[PDB]
Amino acid sequence: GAQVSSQKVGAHENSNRAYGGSTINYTTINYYRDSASNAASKQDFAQDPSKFTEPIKDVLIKTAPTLN
Amino acid sequence: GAQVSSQKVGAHENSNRAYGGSTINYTTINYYRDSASNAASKQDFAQDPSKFTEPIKDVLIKTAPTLN
Amino acid sequence: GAQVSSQKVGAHENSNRAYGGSTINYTTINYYRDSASNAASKQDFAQDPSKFTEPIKDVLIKTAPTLN
Amino acid sequence: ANNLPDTQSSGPAHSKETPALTAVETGATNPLVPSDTVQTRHVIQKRTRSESTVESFFARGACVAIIEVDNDSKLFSVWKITYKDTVQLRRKLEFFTYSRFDMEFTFVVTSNYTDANNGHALNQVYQIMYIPPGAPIPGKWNDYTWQTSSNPSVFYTYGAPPARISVPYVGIANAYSHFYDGFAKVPLAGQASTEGDSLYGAASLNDFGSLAVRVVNDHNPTKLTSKIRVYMKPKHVRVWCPRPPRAVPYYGPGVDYKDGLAPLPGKGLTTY
Amino acid sequence: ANNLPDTQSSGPAHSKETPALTAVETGATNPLVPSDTVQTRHVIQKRTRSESTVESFFARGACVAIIEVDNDSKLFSVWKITYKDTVQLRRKLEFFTYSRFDMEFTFVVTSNYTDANNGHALNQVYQIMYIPPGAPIPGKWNDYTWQTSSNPSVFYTYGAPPARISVPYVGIANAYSHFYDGFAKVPLAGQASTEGDSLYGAASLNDFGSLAVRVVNDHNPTKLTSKIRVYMKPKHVRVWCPRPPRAVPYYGPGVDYKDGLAPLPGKGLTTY
Amino acid sequence: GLPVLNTPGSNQYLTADNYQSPCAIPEFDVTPPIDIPGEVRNMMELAEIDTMIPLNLTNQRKNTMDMYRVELNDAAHSDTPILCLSLSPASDPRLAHTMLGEILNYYTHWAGSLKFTFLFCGSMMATGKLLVSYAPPGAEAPKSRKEAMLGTHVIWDIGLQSSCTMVVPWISNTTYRQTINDSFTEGGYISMFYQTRVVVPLSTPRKMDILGFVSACNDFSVRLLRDTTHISQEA
Amino acid sequence: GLPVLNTPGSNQYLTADNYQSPCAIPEFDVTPPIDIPGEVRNMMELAEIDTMIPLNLTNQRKNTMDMYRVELNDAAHSDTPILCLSLSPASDPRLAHTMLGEILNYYTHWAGSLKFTFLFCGSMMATGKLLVSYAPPGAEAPKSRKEAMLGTHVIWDIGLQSSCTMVVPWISNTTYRQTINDSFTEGGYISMFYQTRVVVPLSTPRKMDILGFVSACNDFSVRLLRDTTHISQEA
Amino acid sequence: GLPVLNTPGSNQYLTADNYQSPCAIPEFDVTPPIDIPGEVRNMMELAEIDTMIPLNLTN
Amino acid sequence: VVQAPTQVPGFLGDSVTLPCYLQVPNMEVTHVSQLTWARHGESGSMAVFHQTQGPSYSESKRLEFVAARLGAELRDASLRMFGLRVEDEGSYTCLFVTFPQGSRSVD
Amino acid sequence: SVRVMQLTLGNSTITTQEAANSVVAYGRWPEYIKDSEANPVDQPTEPDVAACRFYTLDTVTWRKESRGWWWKLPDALKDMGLFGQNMFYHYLGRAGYTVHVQCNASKFHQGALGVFAVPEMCLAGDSTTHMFTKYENANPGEKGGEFKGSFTLDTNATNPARNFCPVDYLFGSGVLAGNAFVYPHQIINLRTNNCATLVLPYVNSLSIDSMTKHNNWGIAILPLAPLDFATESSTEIPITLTIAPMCCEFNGLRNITVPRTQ
Numbered sequence A, B, C: 001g002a003q004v005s006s007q008k009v010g011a012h013e014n015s016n017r018a019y020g021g022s023t024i025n026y027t028t029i030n031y032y033r034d035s036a037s038n039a040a041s042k043q044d045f046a047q048d049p050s051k052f053t054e055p056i057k058d059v060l061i062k063t064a065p066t067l068n
Numbered sequence D, E: 001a002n003n004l005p006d007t008q009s010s011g012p013a014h015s016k017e018t019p020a021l022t023a024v025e026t027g028a029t030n031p032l033v034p035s036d037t038v039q040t041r042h043v044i045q046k047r048t049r050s051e052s053t054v055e056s057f058f059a060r061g062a063c064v065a066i067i068e069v070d071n072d073s074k075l076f077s078v079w080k081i082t083y084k085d086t087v088q089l090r091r092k093l094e095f096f097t098y099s100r101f102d103m104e105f106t107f108v109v110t111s112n113y114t115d116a117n118n119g120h121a122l123n124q125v126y127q128i129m130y131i132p133p134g135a136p137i138p139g140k141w142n143d144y145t146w147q148t149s150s151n152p153s154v155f156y157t158y159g160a161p162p163a164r165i166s167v168p169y170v171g172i173a174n175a176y177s178h179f180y181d182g183f184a185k186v187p188l189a190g191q192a193s194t195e196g197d198s199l200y201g202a203a204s205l206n207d208f209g210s211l212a213v214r215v216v217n218d219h220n221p222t223k224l225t226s227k228i229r230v231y232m233k234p235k236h237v238r239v240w241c242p243r244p245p246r247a248v249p250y251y252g253p254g255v256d257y258k259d260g261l262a263p264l265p266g267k268g269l270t271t272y
Numbered sequence F, G: 001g002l003p004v005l006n007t008p009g010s011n012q013y014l015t016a017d018n019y020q021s022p023c024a025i026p027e028f029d030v031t032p033p034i035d036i037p038g039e040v041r042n043m044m045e046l047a048e049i050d051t052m053i054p055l056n057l058t059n060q061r062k063n064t065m066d067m068y069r070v071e072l073n074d075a076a077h078s079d080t081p082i083l084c085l086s087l088s089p090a091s092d093p094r095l096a097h098t099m100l101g102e103i104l105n106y107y108t109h110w111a112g113s114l115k116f117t118f119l120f121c122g123s124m125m126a127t128g129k130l131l132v133s134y135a136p137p138g139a140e141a142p143k144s145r146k147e148a149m150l151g152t153h154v155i156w157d158i159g160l161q162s163s164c165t166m167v168v169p170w171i172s173n174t175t176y177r178q179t180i181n182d183s184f185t186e187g188g189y190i191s192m193f194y195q196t197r198v199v200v201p202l203s204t205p206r207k208m209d210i211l212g213f214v215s216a217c218n219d220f221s222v223r224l225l226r227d228t229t230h231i232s233q234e235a
Numbered sequence H: 001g002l003p004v005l006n007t008p009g010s011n012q013y014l015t016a017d018n019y020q021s022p023c024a025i026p027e028f029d030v031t032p033p034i035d036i037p038g039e040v041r042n043m044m045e046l047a048e049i050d051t052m053i054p055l056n057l058t059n
Numbered sequence I: 001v002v003q004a005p006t007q008v009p010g011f012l013g014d015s016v017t018l019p020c021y022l023q024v025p026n027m028e029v030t031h032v033s034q035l036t037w038a039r040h041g042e043s044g045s046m047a048v049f050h051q052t053q054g055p056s057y058s059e060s061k062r063l064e065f066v067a068a069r070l071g072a073e074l075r076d077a078s079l080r081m082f083g084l085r086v087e088d089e090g091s092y093t094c095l096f097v098t099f100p101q102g103s104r105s106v107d
Numbered sequence J: 001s002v003r004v005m006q007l008t009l010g011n012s013t014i015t016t017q018e019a020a021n022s023v024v025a026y027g028r029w030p031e032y033i034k035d036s037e038a039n040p041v042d043q044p045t046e047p048d049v050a051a052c053r054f055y056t057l058d059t060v061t062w063r064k065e066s067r068g069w070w071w072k073l074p075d076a077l078k079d080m081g082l083f084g085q086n087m088f089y090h091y092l093g094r095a096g097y098t099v100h101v102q103c104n105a106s107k108f109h110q111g112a113l114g115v116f117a118v119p120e121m122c123l124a125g126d127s128t129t130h131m132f133t134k135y136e137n138a139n140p141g142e143k144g145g146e147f148k149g150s151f152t153l154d155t156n157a158t159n160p161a162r163n164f165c166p167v168d169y170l171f172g173s174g175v176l177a178g179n180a181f182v183y184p185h186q187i188i189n190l191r192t193n194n195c196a197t198l199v200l201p202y203v204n205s206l207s208i209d210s211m212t213k214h215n216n217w218g219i220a221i222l223p224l225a226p227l228d229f230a231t232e233s234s235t236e237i238p239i240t241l242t243i244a245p246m247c248c249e250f251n252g253l254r255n256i257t258v259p260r261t262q
């Protein structure tokens, strides 16, 4: 039940282990039945800001005149 | 001897790990020989209340007259 | 997600385990998502000192006259 | 939590396309990038927004309460669960209207002799009992309620690493409301003014219940005080409807204000 | 971190190749080996440079600060983060102009009664809060800033193994500069001398922020002092541009000198 | 049992750790979610929405609705600035309290491009051309249109499209700037001038307001979460 | 839970340990690296670069630029040494402060070959032959050219190639020597003599300087990291 | 031994935890079960049985 | 320790100074000793006297800074606000930074 | 074009020749409750055309001195035809809206109105007692309320007003008004447009709620640039508000609710 993800290496050691292998991976295993007990995975996604930045009914191009 | 079950995720993180993978599973291993030492699995079943709610000899339909 | 490397055995015990097998290997597993949390692998490479010892434009042979 | 787009090189322009001109009346923000108004070079973007994700923004244990007990009714204390007793976490949560997450509670317990040269006591054990709305609240530091046959309790031994427990999403709605524009009651026509009156913006009188804390050891005449600092961290976070942050000082559980109403300093219009 | 080459046997010579003669004016070092100037035997080399790798050279926890707090404003202290408060680690880092690494911080906490026969206190808990440049600095050992809703804090219980945390590469440049030949400001023509003046070799006024340390327990009239010794170890190290090491005593954060300007002893030219 | 060795850091409490812990309310039937409109995934999404800038912080206007209004008039052409600002998004008093500035105050570093949009609120009969400018740090802050015109600038012609956007490109020495006023990571100057002049016919108001807006571009990012000074608590 | 047993060494703090620990600033967007010129991978790379030796530590010359200059002259041939040195790279005052000596003072053991390069800074019209020597320990330190010539030596003829290198081979009993003055691991003696004599014509300077350089060979290594005595801190 | 790091929450006693523990009476010969009538699996089964309401609470 | 006496009228016209004295005990002397001033004030988040090495004017053009700076002292610094309009209060703060404990002061 | 539109709902049609597009809040169009998000089990009532139509609330007048106006939904529509009837006859109710604000002037007038739709628009009170505003004051109906230029604390202890005191630059809730642009909005700048149109989906932490106890949306109108004309210090232009509920569905029918008033 182990989950193996890879790390985003910031500072690199003068090793090939700093660039590949299990040496740039980390392992995770959940010990509790309730999902609330789990830690945060932090592999979180993003989205389009459009719902806030452009909640416009009739879609407009920036090059084209906004007021038409 | 590890037992791998899946959790019933309540609050979901903005990750795909919150929806799939070993990240929504939990692992268990018994360390003791006596079953008494074990924790509760909590994957418990339900049953029909009929033995209490309708301990009637001649089965009756709700749409149909009870006193016949 | 375990990384298995071999050790450079210095003092040898009067065992065959001191010369081979998993007995001269060591195991590693990363527990943290951030690479900063990792220990140093210490399997570090070397390089050519030439950039410091001979930062000369026109490469010269030691047997041959330096001033030509 | 990802990458940002590269800057593409952009040369001069002489066209009928004018991205610089717009009309903000529509309610939209002009999505311009540098190459729209100036000549740019190609830049391979390596910066990411990994630390500004909703999760990383809240992934910190914030203090929400400091419960105090004097082991010489003060032999036990009760804290009504809330995030509004402090200001820092509260302000961050209020960037959004609704939220849904799990909670991690860490308890830092400290104690000391009130007297520099008097009294002595053996190591203390604390009991932190959660009293869900409806359960009997302790009247004495040692009455029957502390049997916790159903209420979750945490027994902490002084000096041990801070205690920590996780709580699932416990709301009775599909999300926690940071703002509730309403009442719990509707006054009906004909009833006395005393009737049907309730607080504005309040839901249940007892939303999440409270914590009852006490020292389990028999109290000695020695003067001692303990403080349990409660730290809470939202994990597995989802938030809805952004709102402008609090600009003036908080004045209670509501959006009420009173004191620091002039937050901005003076600065010349033409002064850099 | 590897092997050294074997010595090959070398016999006598009588040739027009003269590796012994050179011209150091070129700026190069003569790459001679023993067999170039003497007759050698074959030696199978087994020595390696495993311990002199840049990583192994720095792989040690060095003391960079001793923060002191008197639990009877001294109830809390603030330390501006730096590696120049001590000399040993500083001198090693300065063998290079630039560096890039992660950091591991270990905190050794000690405390004691000032009085041999007076006072008593229960076990202390410490809070080490990191205040990034910009965050509010504590004014009292117990003001709102200690809620740490966003600042990273470490709560240490006296007597527990030394606390330890890791920090990523946090520089705003692509590498840390051990030397900065410049200023943060350029004085412009016309402005008052008070204007545009800044320290030579200084970048930001607040590079990495500081640490705020305090004892969380309520202070007792008892006289107590605690000291937090901060140890830092660079891990995952990369360094650029070697420099000669510091020969005379340090005189501040800069390369300034004043006192031990005559480091070398006397020795006869023809004395072994 | 299995032989273990306790390493330094044991029994500590790092406020920013990420570990598992036992659940105090096991087997709890969690209320499922519903699709509520307006969900947010990243704080940077909020920094990309136009927010009105309190440009007029003069003693009579600060902390009133007038702090948002910058007045223009039909006077003859002048080379003096209409407004001046420093590119310190988290610290300049005029930028520090916008949605963008509020978010930047929870972080220690910022990097990326910004854009300023100006809305003309004069009558339809009013016309005019304005010069919006951005000067990277290092030289004297522009005090005349002549100096401003030598840096990044957009000449705004007023008409049907009521607004105009000027993008302040990411021009920096360091890879990230600090969210505090610091000369080492200084950002430059923003200023506005009259290109020609505001012209109105008879029976038309000779003075009108313009409103300014600020938002982050798609290459904007922040790092190192910290505490803000924008909220306090006494006692 | 899983039964464990705590072994001795638990809860200690070894200054040289290598364990993992939690990150205090999680999800931090690290600034990527750039290819900066002059990167170093091993400290031994620095020990292989020629560094000038402060050979003249006489009271008037020590701690001045003159400590690096060893003067020669056109006097008639003499068998007395021009200079004398002991092969104690980390402890001899003349070697202890060179780049090589500085690095050796951070280690307890050293092994390998060394090379000494001498630069003739006389005029072009000056000629001469010199004998550079190395005598392994155990006998009387050479005081005349006659004794020096019996050990390892290079006869340097001055001319176009301005410099001459003498390699001091690794001749030792122990596999590693100590970086302190200790007779058990003593290294021997280095000395220089006139082979013929320095000769100059008329209208030419009769005295000139030579500069010495020292660096490690490719078979040089050090071990056992220790603290240097070359840096201190009072109060 | 294997290097470990103690996390907060260590040595605490959560009244609602679910862990394993050693058995104080090992190898005990447990009496097997018999099929007793009326077994219950969920408390909600009991809530579904009609129960008489005390409607007349007058003094 | 912090011992600021500045509770000053303050005369208008103007102009007068806005001082800040931090007398230093006494055997554990203070560095780094940069001095910050935050107004009170729509502070989001600047109208600041900050002084790292060279005195930096965070933009309130109408300021005068008089401390023996670019070197050190340390800080019993005096500020001045001219002018000359009633850009009033509100309030002002005076916060210092320190290698020992003192990244802190008083409003 | 972006400027000409026609909206038809039920028996009501709205035309405009000077629009600036329309905003659909959070990009969500109103919808009915799906079976997977359903809660109350009883059959809902969906009045459709009888309730989902344009209702014109009272016209307010904009002057140089106006500070702003506010309304609460569904509150402002509680007395509107069959929508109000269904609201009061049912325990639970849900609806989305099409808000159309109208304001025409001339080419020689100036001024800009910021029209914001705020979910859970909680306003600040007038006393030192927290959350003291009473139901009757919080729910003004179609007449709504107004913003003030400053906070004035109610001190009458004998007869507290128990009302709101929404200061304009503080957005009536302790936040800066310039940041209110993070909420769905449009701007009626007199030199550009006649109106503002916003389509609001149902927003709440529940699928359905009590319309009498809870107001889901708040409509705030603030003069961003004050009204000015030619040389007439005296200028007044009306602002009419027309709102249409959408996808109305009610649950829990019983006797009608008659709330206490004034």
Ligand SMILES: COc1ccc(OCc2ccc(COc3c(Cl)cccc3Cl)cc2)c(Cl)c1
Residues within 6 Å of the ligand: D064, D081, D082, D083, D093, D099, D103, D105, D128, D129, D130, D152, D153, D154, D165, D167, D170, D176, D177, D178, D208, D211, D232, F024, F025
């Ligand atoms: C929107 O932001 C929110 C929403 C809900 C919150 O509190 C809900 C809540 C409900 C129950 C418990 C009980 O938790 C505990 C238990 Cl079982 C056992 C022991 C100790 C605790 Cl501590 C704790 C918090 C908070 Cl603090 C912020």
Ligand SMILES: COc1ccc(OCc2ccc(COc3c(Cl)cccc3Cl)cc2)c(Cl)c1
Residues within 6 Å of the ligand: E064, E081, E082, E083, E093, E099, E103, E105, E128, E129, E130, E152, E153, E154, E165, E167, E170, E176, E177, E178, E208, E211, E232, G024, G025
């Ligand atoms: C070239 O050599 C260098 C470069 C940078 C350095 O310091 C950078 C630095 C930045 C932030 C922190 C903050 O670290 C901490 C945190 Cl998050 C939490 C708790 C405690 C600490 Cl301690 C610590 C150091 C040092 Cl010491 C040497």
